[PDB]
Every structure is written in structure tokens, then in C-alpha cells.
């Protein structure tokens, strides 16, 4: 994620948005407000950068 | 000056970007350097890859109306054809709902 | 076309540009596999009937 | 099926907007016509997600030079841009060549941006290519009364 | 998205008005021709938003010093403006040579 | 500059350029009218459905 | 400002702006009417059931 400021004519990175994948995304306990929590049926999440 | 002398106050500096089409238009007819455009790469107006100036002249709009009119016709036809798809989908869904 | 991950894809649309480093890329930042680089102070670019 | 049709509709609308903008900015001097380019998008295989806009590109072919007279104007024959500075330190680059002089004797375009050029130094002043570009001033103060050195 | 069309129409109407004013004010001794100046606009995305007008520009080119006779008429062949004052005291500058 | 008594300057306006400028401006106005006509006709078929 | 004798002032109304504004207003009115029609149909379908 890059941010452009008033001067310096060069974007400055403010961080990265890694995302986590699961072995079995079906077995995620679905709490409200569009949120999932991992359970025993879904493996431990593994994080990675997008596109890899 | 009236003393038959010439005084130089500097010279106009040009700029050749590494690649155009990466410059971001900023409202009025100016461009702002950014990524995909490189540094300004300033230089004199005489040599290098820079062009030769011509005093007392200006550039035209390099826009041809003949191309634009036919392009507008084609674009309008494409838009109408696209809207036909939405109309057909709406009719299909209405028929499915009514049963 | 050389994808960022490392593999190669194939395209049929010809609309090429130059990135900041001077190498010929496609619209989208992806660079051609042979890695053709356009030098600075280039008056004109010509492409023959063949690939030269 | 609404998604694909809506995406196509938006792409056509953007194309029409670009066409209209090109057709309206005619008779502008430092203007380059722009065109839109589209690209399809497939999630996996056998599934189409419509179309998206892959950026708008401006054709930088030089326009027809016009003999408008005047003295404080200049047309660039080939690739090149004029470098201007904003009051806040920002640096812009322009192709239009309409110049004028403001109250403090600075070369300014029609919008209120100071033209930048190589400073002149020395006695008599000369042109140096190693100096940082600065806003150009042309004051009306009389030249110094230099004495005779050699003949 | 009528912004492009209406901005273009305004620019064209202004250009027509300037041309009409210039042609109408022909044969006027102390008259300087004018010309419109346009500029594109870009607010957000890369798609343009029309064209604005950047104010008219006069042309201070010298005319032709025709010899109409009499003595209460002076013409300027170079840079320079006659300075005049009104009844209320404000100061104006002009180039008209018709005096009496 | 110097002054010349018994003379008046011209209007520095030439009709030859003005006529062609009027013609091209008229063509630009017609083109923009076509553009707005298209922009209205495209919305008409959307609203009518 | 001083008065000018034997002269009259115009209406400072340009038909070019007025016609295009009328077209835009008509299209906006038609769109708003379409909204009312859609709401009426959405209510009729619900109540009929």
C-alpha cells in the first residue's frame, strides 16, 4: 500500500496487506458480520503475500 | 539596451521524460512527473533528443473531428446493444418470477 | 510475457509501452520475454515485417 | 448476468466520455488526444467477469504548428516539455507556449505558474549548464556602467 | 455526463462572441484585436472533464498610421499609452487619437 | 516611442483570418451539438427501457 | 457607474445555456418519474402477493 503526499514527488509505502489461506476453507465457523473463525476442521492459517 | 549591447538573463530548460503516457494530468494543461515516467532529465533546447524551438508559434490540438464523430456513432451503437442484454435479462427474470 | 511470479503467459493484443527503466512492456506493466530495452535519446522506433 | 452487462455498459460510457472530452478540447493549443483501452477478465475458466478499463493513453504526436505572431510564445518542434514551478515548490511540465510577464517581472504561463530556466551568472553574465533551474526574472533595472578594460 | 458537452458549447460560444466582437470593431482606430485562450481540466480520474476558458488576450500589434489630416490627432508607432483622467478623478489609459 | 501628428493607427484586424476562424468555430459548435445529441439519445433508451 | 444617454440594456439571457439546461432538466424529471413507477410496482407486487 503506497501513499502519495504533497511534496517529494514519490509515493511512500505504508505497509503490506498479507492474506492468510486455509487448508479447508469450508470448515470455518461463520460468526456474524461476515466473519469466520478457524476450528479443528480447518487447518492452521498460513499467511502469504497476494499472488503467491 | 540602447547602448547597442545584449544582456542574457538565462535560458529556457527543456525536459525529456524516459517514458511519456505515465505523466498524470493536473487540471490545466500541465503534467506532473511520477512513476512510470522517470526523472525530468533536463537539458538545453539545442542538442540531445530535445526538439528545436520556433519563436512566435504554437501547437494545434492534434484532434481530428472526422475520426471522433464515427467513433461516437460506433460507441453509441455498442452501448445500445449492451443495454439490450440488460432488457432481455430483466424480461427473463420477470417471466421466471411470474411463473 | 514474463509474469511477476516467474512463469510466462501469452497474449494476442499488441499495444506496447516503455516502463521507467526503458524496457518494452505491455499495457499492465508486464515485460516481454526476450526483454527488449529501448535506449534513451531515441529518434524513432521501427519494426519490420519480421520480428526485428 | 447483470454483472457482465453492467461492466460492458460502464466501459462503453467511459469510451463515450473520452470521445466527448477529446471532441470538446479542440482548439486547445497544448492538448493531446486520449483514447481508452479495455481488457477482459476471467476468474478461472469458462467464466467471464465482463470487461475493465486498462487505462487511458494520450497520443503525443506533435500538432500542427501555427504562425500566431507575437513574441512571447514558442512552439516545440519535437519531443520536449517546458518546466514550470508552483508557488508551493511543486514542479510541473507543460507543452503549451503561452507566456506573459507578471508584476514582479517573472515569465509566467496563463495560469499563474513561474517558468523555470537556467540561471545566468557572471559579469557579463553567461549561461552555465551545471546550475540548478530557477524561476526566470527579467527586471528593467539598467545595466552597470562597466569601465574599459582592454581594446 | 453532460459536463463535456456543455463545457465545449460554452467554449465555442465564447469563441464565436470574441470573433464577432473583433469583426464588428473593425475600422476602429484605437482598437486591439483579442483572442480566447482555452485549457483542459482534470479533476479526478484520467478521463477529462471538459475545457475552461483562461481569459481573452489582446493583441498590441501596431496598426497603420493613416494620414487623415487636421492637427488634433496623434498616433503612436511603438509602445506607449496615453493617460487620461475623468470627472471623478480616476485614471484610465487609451490609444485613441481623436482629440478636440 | 515617437509620436506622429495628423495620423491615426488602424484596427490591426484582418477579415481573411476572421472568416475562416468563424467557419471553424461554427463547425466545432456543430460537432459539440452532435455530441450532446448522442449523450441525450443514449440516456433516452436507458430510461425508456 | 455613469449613465449613457439614448441607449438601453439587454436581458443578459443566452438561449444556448437555456436549451441545454432544459434538456438536462427534462431527463432528470423523467428519471425521477421512473423512480416513482419502480416504487409503485415494488409495492403492488408485494401487496398482491
Coordinates of C-alpha atoms in Angstrom, one line a residue:
Chain A
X1 CA 0.0 0.0 0.0
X2 CA 1.6 3.3 -1.2
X3 CA 0.6 6.8 -0.2
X4 CA 1.3 10.0 -2.2
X5 CA 1.9 13.2 -0.3
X6 CA 2.0 16.9 -1.1
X7 CA 5.7 17.0 -2.0
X8 CA 8.7 14.8 -2.7
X9 CA 7.1 13.5 -6.0
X10 CA 7.5 9.9 -4.8
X11 CA 5.0 7.5 -3.3
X12 CA 5.9 6.2 0.2
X13 CA 4.9 2.7 1.2
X14 CA 2.8 2.4 4.4
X15 CA 2.7 -1.3 4.7
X16 CA 1.5 -4.5 3.1
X17 CA -1.8 -6.4 3.1
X18 CA -0.9 -10.1 3.6
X19 CA -3.7 -12.6 3.4
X20 CA -4.0 -16.0 5.1
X21 CA -5.2 -19.1 3.4
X22 CA -6.7 -22.3 5.0
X23 CA -6.4 -25.9 4.1
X24 CA -10.1 -26.4 4.2
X25 CA -12.0 -23.1 3.9
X26 CA -15.4 -24.9 4.1
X27 CA -14.8 -25.8 7.8
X28 CA -14.8 -22.3 9.1
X29 CA -17.3 -21.4 11.9
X30 CA -19.2 -18.5 10.5
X31 CA -19.9 -15.8 13.1
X32 CA -22.0 -12.8 12.1
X33 CA -20.8 -9.6 10.4
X34 CA -19.1 -11.6 7.6
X35 CA -16.5 -13.1 9.8
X36 CA -15.1 -16.6 10.0
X37 CA -13.2 -18.3 12.8
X38 CA -11.0 -21.3 12.3
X39 CA -11.9 -24.6 14.0
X40 CA -10.4 -28.1 14.3
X41 CA -11.8 -29.0 10.8
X42 CA -9.8 -26.2 9.2
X43 CA -6.1 -26.2 9.4
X44 CA -3.9 -23.5 11.0
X45 CA -3.9 -20.5 8.7
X46 CA -0.8 -19.8 6.6
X47 CA -0.2 -16.2 5.7
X48 CA 1.3 -15.1 2.4
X49 CA 1.5 -12.1 0.1
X50 CA -1.1 -12.0 -2.7
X51 CA -0.2 -13.8 -5.9
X52 CA 2.0 -16.4 -4.3
Chain B
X1 CA 19.7 48.1 -24.4
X2 CA 20.1 51.4 -26.1
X3 CA 23.9 51.2 -25.8
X4 CA 23.9 48.6 -28.6
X5 CA 24.6 45.8 -26.1
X6 CA 22.9 42.4 -25.5
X7 CA 22.3 41.1 -21.9
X8 CA 21.4 37.4 -21.4
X9 CA 19.3 36.5 -18.4
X10 CA 19.4 32.7 -18.7
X11 CA 17.8 30.1 -21.0
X12 CA 14.7 28.0 -21.0
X13 CA 15.4 24.4 -19.9
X14 CA 13.6 21.6 -21.6
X15 CA 12.9 18.1 -20.3
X16 CA 12.7 14.7 -22.0
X17 CA 11.0 12.0 -19.9
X18 CA 12.1 8.4 -20.0
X19 CA 8.6 7.4 -21.0
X20 CA 5.6 9.6 -21.7
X21 CA 2.0 8.4 -21.1
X22 CA 2.9 8.0 -17.4
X23 CA 2.6 11.6 -16.7
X24 CA -0.5 12.4 -14.7
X25 CA -2.6 15.3 -16.0
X26 CA -3.2 18.0 -13.4
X27 CA -6.2 20.1 -14.3
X28 CA -4.9 22.8 -16.6
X29 CA -2.5 22.0 -19.5
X30 CA 0.4 20.8 -17.3
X31 CA 1.8 17.4 -16.3
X32 CA 3.3 16.1 -13.1
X33 CA 6.2 13.7 -13.0
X34 CA 5.6 10.4 -11.2
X35 CA 6.3 6.7 -11.5
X36 CA 6.4 5.1 -15.0
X37 CA 7.8 8.4 -16.2
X38 CA 11.2 8.7 -14.6
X39 CA 13.1 11.8 -13.7
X40 CA 12.8 15.0 -15.7
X41 CA 16.2 14.6 -17.5
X42 CA 16.6 18.3 -18.1
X43 CA 18.7 19.7 -20.9
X44 CA 19.2 22.5 -23.4
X45 CA 16.8 23.2 -26.3
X46 CA 19.5 22.9 -29.0
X47 CA 21.1 19.4 -28.8
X48 CA 20.3 16.0 -27.5
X49 CA 17.0 14.3 -28.1
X50 CA 15.2 17.7 -27.5
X51 CA 13.4 19.4 -30.3
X52 CA 14.2 22.7 -31.9
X53 CA 12.1 25.7 -30.7
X54 CA 10.3 28.1 -33.1
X55 CA 9.7 31.6 -31.9
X56 CA 6.2 33.1 -32.3
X57 CA 4.3 30.0 -32.9
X58 CA 2.0 27.5 -31.1
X59 CA 0.9 23.9 -31.5
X60 CA -2.5 22.8 -32.6
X61 CA -4.9 20.4 -30.9
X62 CA -3.9 17.3 -33.0
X63 CA -7.6 16.2 -32.8
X64 CA -9.5 15.3 -35.9
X65 CA -13.2 15.6 -35.8
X66 CA -13.9 13.1 -38.6
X67 CA -12.5 10.2 -36.5
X68 CA -14.3 11.4 -33.4
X69 CA -17.7 11.5 -35.0
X70 CA -17.6 8.0 -36.4
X71 CA -16.1 6.7 -33.1
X72 CA -19.0 8.3 -31.2
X73 CA -21.5 6.6 -33.6
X74 CA -19.9 3.2 -33.0
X75 CA -19.7 3.8 -29.3
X76 CA -23.4 4.7 -29.1
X77 CA -24.4 1.6 -31.1
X78 CA -22.3 -0.6 -28.7
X79 CA -24.0 1.0 -25.7
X80 CA -27.5 0.3 -27.1
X81 CA -26.5 -3.3 -27.9
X82 CA -25.3 -3.7 -24.3
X83 CA -28.5 -2.3 -22.9
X84 CA -30.4 -4.8 -25.0
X85 CA -28.8 -7.5 -22.9
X86 CA -30.0 -6.0 -19.6
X87 CA -33.5 -5.6 -21.0
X88 CA -33.6 -9.3 -22.1
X89 CA -32.2 -10.4 -18.7
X90 CA -34.9 -8.4 -16.9
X91 CA -37.6 -10.0 -19.1
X92 CA -36.3 -13.5 -18.5
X93 CA -36.2 -12.9 -14.7
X94 CA -39.8 -11.4 -14.8
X95 CA -41.0 -14.5 -16.7
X96 CA -39.4 -16.8 -14.2
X97 CA -40.8 -14.9 -11.2
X98 CA -44.4 -14.7 -12.6
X99 CA -44.4 -18.5 -13.4
Chain C
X1 CA 5.0 -12.2 -21.5
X2 CA 7.0 -12.6 -18.3
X3 CA 4.7 -12.7 -15.3
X4 CA 5.8 -11.3 -12.0
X5 CA 5.7 -14.6 -10.2
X6 CA 8.2 -16.1 -12.7
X7 CA 6.2 -18.0 -15.3
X8 CA 5.2 -16.9 -18.7
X9 CA 1.8 -16.1 -20.2
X10 CA 0.8 -15.5 -23.8
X11 CA -1.1 -12.5 -25.3
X12 CA -2.6 -11.6 -28.7
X13 CA -3.2 -7.9 -28.1
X14 CA -0.4 -5.7 -29.4
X15 CA -0.2 -2.4 -27.5
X16 CA 3.3 -1.8 -26.1
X17 CA 4.7 0.9 -24.0
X18 CA 8.0 1.6 -22.2
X19 CA 8.5 1.4 -18.5
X20 CA 10.6 3.6 -16.3
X21 CA 13.8 1.5 -16.9
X22 CA 13.4 1.7 -20.7
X23 CA 12.4 -1.9 -21.5
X24 CA 9.4 -2.7 -23.7
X25 CA 6.4 -3.8 -21.7
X26 CA 2.7 -4.4 -22.4
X27 CA -0.2 -2.3 -21.1
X28 CA -0.2 -3.5 -17.5
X29 CA 3.5 -3.4 -16.6
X30 CA 4.3 -6.9 -17.8
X31 CA 7.5 -7.1 -19.9
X32 CA 8.1 -9.2 -23.0
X33 CA 10.1 -12.4 -22.5
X34 CA 13.1 -11.5 -24.8
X35 CA 13.4 -8.3 -22.7
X36 CA 13.7 -5.7 -25.4
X37 CA 15.1 -2.5 -24.0
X38 CA 14.6 0.9 -25.8
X39 CA 17.6 3.1 -25.3
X40 CA 17.2 6.8 -24.4
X41 CA 17.5 9.6 -26.9
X42 CA 15.6 7.5 -29.4
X43 CA 14.5 9.4 -32.5
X44 CA 12.2 6.7 -33.9
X45 CA 11.3 3.1 -33.5
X46 CA 10.7 0.8 -36.5
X47 CA 9.5 -2.8 -36.6
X48 CA 10.0 -4.7 -39.8
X49 CA 7.7 -7.3 -41.4
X50 CA 9.6 -10.0 -39.4
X51 CA 10.3 -9.7 -35.6
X52 CA 13.4 -7.4 -35.9
Chain D
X1 CA -25.7 -11.9 -15.8
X2 CA -26.2 -8.3 -14.7
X3 CA -22.5 -8.0 -13.7
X4 CA -21.1 -8.6 -17.2
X5 CA -23.7 -6.3 -18.9
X6 CA -23.2 -3.6 -16.3
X7 CA -19.4 -3.8 -16.8
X8 CA -19.8 -3.5 -20.6
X9 CA -22.2 -0.6 -20.1
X10 CA -19.6 1.2 -17.9
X11 CA -16.8 0.5 -20.4
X12 CA -19.0 2.0 -23.2
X13 CA -19.8 5.0 -21.1
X14 CA -16.1 5.6 -20.3
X15 CA -15.3 5.3 -24.0
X16 CA -18.1 7.8 -24.9
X17 CA -16.8 10.2 -22.2
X18 CA -13.3 10.1 -23.5
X19 CA -14.6 10.7 -27.1
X20 CA -16.6 13.7 -25.8
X21 CA -13.6 15.1 -23.9
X22 CA -11.5 14.8 -27.0
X23 CA -14.1 16.5 -29.1
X24 CA -14.6 19.4 -26.7
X25 CA -10.9 20.2 -26.0
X26 CA -10.4 21.0 -29.7
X27 CA -8.8 24.4 -30.5
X28 CA -6.8 24.0 -27.3
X29 CA -3.1 24.6 -28.1
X30 CA -1.2 22.3 -25.7
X31 CA -3.6 19.4 -25.9
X32 CA -3.0 15.7 -26.8
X33 CA -6.0 13.5 -27.7
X34 CA -6.5 10.5 -25.4
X35 CA -8.0 7.1 -26.1
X36 CA -9.4 4.3 -23.8
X37 CA -8.2 0.7 -23.8
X38 CA -10.2 -2.2 -22.4
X39 CA -9.2 -5.6 -21.1
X40 CA -11.3 -8.7 -20.3
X41 CA -11.3 -10.5 -17.0
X42 CA -11.8 -14.2 -16.4
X43 CA -11.9 -15.6 -12.8
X44 CA -10.9 -19.1 -13.8
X45 CA -12.0 -20.8 -17.0
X46 CA -15.4 -20.9 -18.8
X47 CA -16.4 -18.0 -16.5
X48 CA -16.4 -14.4 -17.8
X49 CA -16.5 -11.4 -15.4
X50 CA -17.1 -8.7 -18.0
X51 CA -14.5 -6.0 -19.0
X52 CA -12.5 -3.3 -17.3
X53 CA -10.7 -0.2 -18.3
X54 CA -7.0 -0.7 -18.7
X55 CA -6.0 2.9 -18.6
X56 CA -6.3 6.0 -20.8
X57 CA -3.4 6.7 -23.1
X58 CA -2.7 10.1 -24.7
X59 CA -1.2 10.3 -28.2
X60 CA 1.8 12.6 -28.0
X61 CA 2.1 13.2 -31.8
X62 CA 3.1 16.8 -32.3
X63 CA 0.3 19.0 -33.6
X64 CA 0.3 21.4 -36.5
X65 CA 2.4 24.5 -35.7
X66 CA 0.6 27.8 -36.2
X67 CA 2.1 31.2 -37.1
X68 CA 0.2 33.3 -34.5
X69 CA 2.7 36.1 -34.5
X70 CA 3.5 37.7 -31.1
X71 CA 6.9 37.5 -29.4
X72 CA 6.3 35.9 -26.0
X73 CA 5.4 32.5 -27.4
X74 CA 7.3 29.5 -28.7
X75 CA 6.4 26.2 -30.4
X76 CA 8.3 22.9 -29.8
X77 CA 9.0 21.1 -33.0
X78 CA 9.7 17.7 -31.4
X79 CA 9.7 15.8 -28.1
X80 CA 10.2 18.1 -25.1
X81 CA 8.5 19.9 -22.4
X82 CA 8.7 23.3 -20.6
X83 CA 9.4 23.0 -16.9
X84 CA 7.4 25.2 -14.6
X85 CA 7.4 25.7 -10.8
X86 CA 4.5 26.2 -8.5
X87 CA 4.5 28.7 -5.6
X88 CA 4.5 25.7 -3.2
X89 CA 7.7 24.2 -4.6
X90 CA 5.9 21.8 -6.9
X91 CA 7.3 21.2 -10.4
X92 CA 5.1 20.8 -13.4
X93 CA 5.8 20.1 -17.1
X94 CA 3.8 21.6 -19.9
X95 CA 3.6 21.7 -23.7
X96 CA 1.7 24.9 -24.2
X97 CA 3.8 28.0 -25.1
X98 CA 1.6 31.0 -24.0
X99 CA 3.9 33.2 -21.8
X100 CA 3.4 36.6 -20.2
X101 CA 5.1 38.8 -17.6
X102 CA 3.6 39.5 -14.2
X103 CA 4.1 42.4 -11.9
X104 CA 7.4 41.3 -10.4
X105 CA 8.8 40.6 -13.9
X106 CA 8.6 36.8 -14.0
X107 CA 7.8 34.7 -17.0
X108 CA 4.5 33.0 -16.2
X109 CA 2.1 30.9 -18.2
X110 CA -1.6 31.9 -18.4
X111 CA -2.5 30.0 -15.2
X112 CA -0.1 31.6 -12.7
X113 CA 3.0 29.3 -12.7
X114 CA 6.6 30.6 -12.9
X115 CA 8.6 29.4 -15.8
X116 CA 11.9 27.8 -14.9
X117 CA 15.2 28.2 -16.7
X118 CA 18.9 28.1 -16.3
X119 CA 20.2 31.0 -14.1
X120 CA 22.7 33.4 -15.6
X121 CA 25.8 34.4 -13.6
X122 CA 28.9 36.4 -14.2
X123 CA 30.0 39.9 -15.3
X124 CA 28.9 39.9 -18.0
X125 CA 26.5 37.1 -17.2
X126 CA 26.8 33.8 -19.1
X127 CA 24.9 30.5 -19.4
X128 CA 26.0 27.6 -17.2
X129 CA 24.6 24.1 -17.5
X130 CA 25.6 23.0 -14.1
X131 CA 23.4 25.3 -12.1
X132 CA 20.0 24.3 -10.7
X133 CA 17.0 25.5 -12.6
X134 CA 15.3 28.6 -11.1
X135 CA 12.4 30.9 -12.0
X136 CA 13.4 33.4 -14.6
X137 CA 13.2 37.1 -13.8
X138 CA 13.6 39.9 -16.3
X139 CA 13.9 43.2 -14.4
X140 CA 14.1 46.5 -16.1
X141 CA 17.0 47.8 -14.0
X142 CA 19.7 49.5 -16.1
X143 CA 23.0 47.6 -16.7
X144 CA 26.0 48.5 -14.7
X145 CA 28.4 51.1 -16.1
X146 CA 31.4 48.9 -16.8
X147 CA 34.7 50.7 -17.4
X148 CA 37.1 50.0 -20.3
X149 CA 39.4 47.1 -19.6
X150 CA 41.1 46.3 -23.0
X151 CA 40.8 47.4 -26.6
Chain E
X1 CA -22.3 13.1 -18.2
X2 CA -23.2 16.4 -19.9
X3 CA -20.2 18.2 -18.5
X4 CA -18.0 17.7 -21.5
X5 CA -20.7 18.8 -24.0
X6 CA -21.8 21.9 -22.0
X7 CA -18.2 23.0 -21.4
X8 CA -17.5 22.6 -25.1
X9 CA -20.6 24.5 -26.0
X10 CA -19.6 27.3 -23.7
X11 CA -16.1 27.5 -25.1
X12 CA -17.5 27.5 -28.7
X13 CA -20.0 30.3 -27.8
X14 CA -17.2 32.4 -26.2
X15 CA -15.0 31.9 -29.3
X16 CA -17.9 33.0 -31.5
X17 CA -18.5 36.0 -29.3
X18 CA -14.8 37.0 -29.5
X19 CA -14.7 36.6 -33.3
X20 CA -17.9 38.7 -33.6
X21 CA -16.6 41.4 -31.4
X22 CA -13.3 41.5 -33.3
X23 CA -15.0 41.7 -36.7
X24 CA -17.6 44.3 -35.5
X25 CA -14.9 46.6 -34.1
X26 CA -13.1 46.8 -37.4
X27 CA -12.3 50.2 -38.8
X28 CA -11.9 51.5 -35.2
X29 CA -8.6 53.4 -34.9
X30 CA -7.8 52.7 -31.3
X31 CA -8.8 49.0 -31.2
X32 CA -6.6 46.0 -30.5
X33 CA -7.8 42.6 -31.6
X34 CA -8.4 39.9 -28.9
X35 CA -8.2 36.1 -28.8
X36 CA -9.6 33.5 -26.5
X37 CA -7.4 31.0 -24.6
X38 CA -8.6 27.6 -23.6
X39 CA -7.4 24.9 -21.2
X40 CA -8.5 21.4 -20.5
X41 CA -9.4 20.3 -17.0
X42 CA -8.8 17.1 -15.0
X43 CA -10.3 16.7 -11.5
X44 CA -10.1 13.0 -10.5
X45 CA -9.7 10.1 -12.8
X46 CA -7.8 10.1 -16.1
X47 CA -11.0 10.9 -18.1
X48 CA -11.3 14.6 -18.8
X49 CA -14.0 16.9 -17.5
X50 CA -14.2 19.5 -20.4
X51 CA -12.4 22.7 -21.2
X52 CA -12.4 26.0 -19.4
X53 CA -11.6 29.4 -20.8
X54 CA -8.5 31.1 -19.5
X55 CA -9.5 34.7 -20.3
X56 CA -9.2 36.7 -23.5
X57 CA -5.8 38.0 -24.7
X58 CA -5.4 41.3 -26.5
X59 CA -3.0 41.9 -29.4
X60 CA -1.0 45.0 -29.1
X61 CA 0.3 45.0 -32.6
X62 CA 0.6 48.4 -34.2
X63 CA -1.9 49.4 -36.9
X64 CA -1.4 51.7 -39.9
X65 CA -0.8 55.4 -39.3
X66 CA -3.3 56.7 -41.9
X67 CA -3.0 60.4 -42.7
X68 CA -6.5 61.8 -42.2
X69 CA -5.4 65.4 -42.0
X70 CA -6.1 68.1 -39.3
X71 CA -3.8 68.6 -36.2
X72 CA -5.8 67.3 -33.2
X73 CA -4.8 63.7 -33.8
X74 CA -1.6 61.9 -32.8
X75 CA -0.6 58.3 -33.5
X76 CA 1.9 56.1 -31.6
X77 CA 4.1 53.8 -33.7
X78 CA 5.6 51.9 -30.7
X79 CA 5.0 51.1 -27.1
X80 CA 3.1 53.7 -25.1
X81 CA -0.3 54.6 -23.8
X82 CA -2.0 57.9 -23.4
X83 CA -3.0 58.7 -19.8
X84 CA -6.4 60.4 -19.2
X85 CA -8.5 61.3 -16.2
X86 CA -12.3 61.5 -15.8
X87 CA -14.5 63.9 -13.9
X88 CA -14.5 61.8 -10.7
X89 CA -10.7 61.7 -10.8
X90 CA -10.0 58.1 -11.7
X91 CA -7.2 57.4 -14.2
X92 CA -7.5 55.5 -17.5
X93 CA -5.2 54.6 -20.3
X94 CA -6.0 54.6 -24.0
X95 CA -4.6 55.0 -27.5
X96 CA -7.4 56.9 -29.3
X97 CA -6.0 59.9 -31.1
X98 CA -9.2 61.8 -31.7
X99 CA -8.9 65.0 -29.6
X100 CA -10.8 68.3 -29.6
Chain F
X1 CA 8.2 55.5 -29.0
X2 CA 7.9 58.6 -31.0
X3 CA 4.6 60.3 -31.9
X4 CA 3.2 61.3 -35.3
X5 CA 0.8 64.3 -35.6
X6 CA -2.1 64.2 -38.0
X7 CA -2.4 60.5 -38.3
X8 CA -4.4 57.6 -36.8
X9 CA -3.5 54.0 -36.4
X10 CA -5.6 51.2 -38.0
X11 CA -7.6 48.5 -36.2
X12 CA -4.9 45.7 -36.8
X13 CA -7.8 43.4 -37.7
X14 CA -7.9 41.4 -41.0
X15 CA -11.1 39.8 -42.1
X16 CA -9.5 37.0 -44.0
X17 CA -8.5 35.2 -40.8
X18 CA -11.7 36.1 -39.0
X19 CA -14.0 34.5 -41.7
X20 CA -12.1 31.2 -41.5
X21 CA -12.0 31.3 -37.7
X22 CA -15.8 31.8 -37.7
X23 CA -16.2 28.8 -40.0
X24 CA -14.1 26.5 -37.9
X25 CA -15.7 27.7 -34.7
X26 CA -19.1 27.0 -36.3
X27 CA -18.0 23.5 -37.2
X28 CA -16.8 22.9 -33.6
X29 CA -20.1 24.1 -32.3
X30 CA -22.0 21.8 -34.6
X31 CA -19.8 18.9 -33.5
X32 CA -20.4 19.6 -29.8
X33 CA -24.1 19.8 -30.6
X34 CA -23.9 16.3 -32.1
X35 CA -22.1 15.1 -29.0
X36 CA -24.8 16.3 -26.7
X37 CA -27.5 14.9 -29.0
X38 CA -25.8 11.5 -28.7
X39 CA -25.5 11.9 -24.9
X40 CA -29.2 12.6 -24.7
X41 CA -30.3 9.8 -27.1
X42 CA -28.2 7.2 -25.2
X43 CA -30.0 8.2 -21.9
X44 CA -33.4 8.1 -23.6
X45 CA -33.1 4.4 -24.5
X46 CA -31.9 3.7 -20.9
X47 CA -34.8 5.5 -19.2
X48 CA -37.4 4.1 -21.6
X49 CA -36.1 0.5 -21.3
Chain G
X1 CA -21.4 53.9 -12.9
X2 CA -22.2 56.9 -15.2
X3 CA -25.4 56.9 -17.3
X4 CA -25.4 56.5 -21.1
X5 CA -28.0 58.6 -22.9
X6 CA -30.2 57.3 -25.7
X7 CA -29.4 53.6 -25.1
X8 CA -31.0 50.5 -23.5
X9 CA -29.7 47.4 -21.7
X10 CA -30.4 43.9 -22.9
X11 CA -31.7 40.9 -20.9
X12 CA -28.4 39.1 -20.4
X13 CA -30.1 35.8 -21.2
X14 CA -28.4 33.4 -23.6
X15 CA -30.6 30.8 -25.3
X16 CA -27.7 28.4 -25.7
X17 CA -27.4 27.7 -22.0
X18 CA -31.2 27.7 -21.6
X19 CA -31.9 25.0 -24.2
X20 CA -29.3 22.6 -22.9
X21 CA -30.4 23.2 -19.3
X22 CA -34.0 22.4 -20.4
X23 CA -32.8 19.1 -21.9
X24 CA -30.9 18.1 -18.8
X25 CA -33.9 19.1 -16.6
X26 CA -36.3 17.0 -18.8
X27 CA -34.0 14.0 -18.5
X28 CA -33.8 14.4 -14.7
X29 CA -37.6 14.7 -14.4
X30 CA -38.0 11.5 -16.5
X31 CA -35.6 9.6 -14.3
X32 CA -37.4 10.8 -11.1
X33 CA -40.7 9.7 -12.6
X34 CA -39.1 6.3 -13.4
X35 CA -38.2 6.0 -9.7
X36 CA -41.8 6.6 -8.7
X37 CA -43.0 4.0 -11.2
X38 CA -40.5 1.4 -9.9
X39 CA -41.6 2.1 -6.3
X40 CA -45.2 1.7 -7.2
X41 CA -44.5 -1.6 -9.0
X42 CA -42.5 -2.8 -6.0
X43 CA -45.4 -2.0 -3.7
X44 CA -48.1 -3.6 -6.0
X45 CA -46.2 -6.8 -6.3
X46 CA -45.8 -7.0 -2.5
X47 CA -49.4 -6.3 -1.7
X48 CA -50.9 -8.5 -4.4
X49 CA -48.7 -11.5 -3.3

